[PDB]
């Protein structure tokens, strides 16, 4: 089950790939039925420009995400 796998990842580092050219890596805090997720200590990666940004904590919207990858 997709959502059971995601649930196993709480407190651990997650790698997220958007349909746009952006990736996020952070610590999964929790998520809702729609897989809107909350991440802590996040690195945002712009995969075209190469630009990186840090975030203490964020609600990452699930609509534009392609993949969530346990690990980083």
């Amino acid at each position: 089950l997709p959502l059971e796998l995601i649930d196993k990842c709480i407190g651990s580092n997650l790698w997220v790939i958007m349909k746009s050219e952006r990736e996020f890596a952070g610590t999964l805090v929790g998520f809702d039925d729609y897989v809107n997720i909350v991440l802590k200590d996040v690195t945002e990666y712009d995969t075209v420009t190469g630009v990186t940004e840090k975030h203490s904590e964020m609600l990452l919207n699930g609509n534009g995400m392609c993949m969530l990858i346990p690990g980083g």
């Binding site: 958007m18 805090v29 809702d32 039925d33 975030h55 964020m58 990452l60």
Partner: protein, 73 residues
């Protein structure tokens, strides 16, 4: 699953947040209230395209379901 998204938004009510769109537009503003659907009421909001402030809003409504992310500032 739980209500971590709504918990996060409640935790940051009255604070400044960064809201990014997948287009690359950024909003920085004060979160006044939300509803259970992640519709957001913002105050004192600045809009940035390519790092240039492009507009300001005393009050704006933002549809949280349609943004890329809301980040604590």
């Amino acid at each position: 699953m739980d209500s971590s998204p709504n918990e996060f938004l409640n935790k940051v009510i009255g604070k400044k947040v960064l809201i990014r769109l997948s287009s690359g537009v950024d909003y920085k503003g004060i979160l006044s209230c939300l509803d259970g659907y992640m519709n957001l009421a913002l105050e004192r909001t600045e809009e940035y395209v390519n790092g240039k402030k492009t507009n300001v809003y005393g009050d704006a409504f933002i549809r949280g379901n349609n943004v890329l992310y809301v980040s604590a500032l």
